[PDB]
């Protein structure tokens, strides 16, 4: 339990630091690359790729993103003090949710494009995946977060809470995770109060929204795996399969 303001502010700076250290993509880099947009020729190229090649490429890049989220957790105060069961439960449920939130940084609301393999492209880039519902949902979600003008520090505190969620089924030290979650909640809300940003509280996504996105991801994978079981077995990252089946 964090009692003084100085303690709470120490948590804030600690969380923000752990975040900055474990982003794979610098905000500055993503912003200054925004003019670098796939041409119609390249978009057509993406649309002509097989469903299985596109899934493999997507599963690969997401897996790399997940690895940075694991590093983020390993650097988070409190997380490494939890038992290994609980560490795994939190990452299993939360890693993809954190990726989805971090993705808003790589999203340009001005033209509805996302950073993918070196350039920005709209959602039509992903048509070969055969999961437009999932894709447009992800895009709408990133759009909603972009409208809030999330700061880097807000992203750090919000993703720490996404991860440190005491309601995850299968936790052995529920009360310990609860205490960590509460301390992080005070840190997030203190920072918002300090920065006159508490108006974002009502505008943050409803809890089950992130869960809906991860469920859709799993559901689409299941269908893909049924169509291409050898591809998943032979060409999907081991970590990705472990997390998503």
């Amino acid at each position: 339990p964090y009692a003084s303001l100085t303690e709470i502010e120490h948590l804030v700076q600690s969380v923000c630091k752990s975040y900055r250290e474990t982003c794979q993509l610098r905000l500055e880099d993503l912003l200054r690359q925004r003019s670098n947009i796939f041409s119609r020729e390249e978009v057509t190229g993406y649309q002509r790729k097989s469903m299985w090649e596109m899934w493999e490429r997507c599963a690969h890049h997401l897996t790399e993103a997940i690895q940075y989220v694991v590093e983020f957790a390993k650097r988070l105060s409190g997380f490494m003090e939890l038992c290994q069961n609980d560490q795994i439960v939190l990452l299993k449920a939360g890693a993809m949710e954190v990726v989805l939130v971090r993705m808003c940084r790589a999203y340009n609301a001005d033209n509805r494009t996302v950073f993918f393999e070196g350039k920005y492209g709209g959602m039509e880039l992903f048509r070969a995946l055969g999961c437009s519902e999932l894709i447009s949902s992800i895009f709408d979600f990133s759009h909603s977060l972009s409208a809030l003008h999330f700061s880097e520090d807000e992203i750090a505190l919000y993703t720490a809470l996404v991860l440190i969620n005491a309601h995850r089924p299968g936790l052995q030290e529920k009360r310990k995770v609860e205490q960590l979650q509460y301390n992080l909640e005070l840190a997030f809300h203190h920072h918002l109060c300090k920065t006159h940003r508490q108006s974002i509280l009502a505008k943050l996504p409803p809890k089950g929204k992130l869960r809906s996105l991860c469920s859709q991801h799993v559901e689409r994978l299941q269908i893909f795996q049924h169509l291409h079981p050898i591809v998943v077995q032979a060409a999907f990252p081991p970590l990705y399969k472990e997390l998503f089946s």
Partner: peptide
């Protein structure tokens, strides 16, 4: 498998 190994 992997998450175990990544955590240590």
């Amino acid at each position: 498998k992997i998450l175990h190994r990544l955590l240590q």
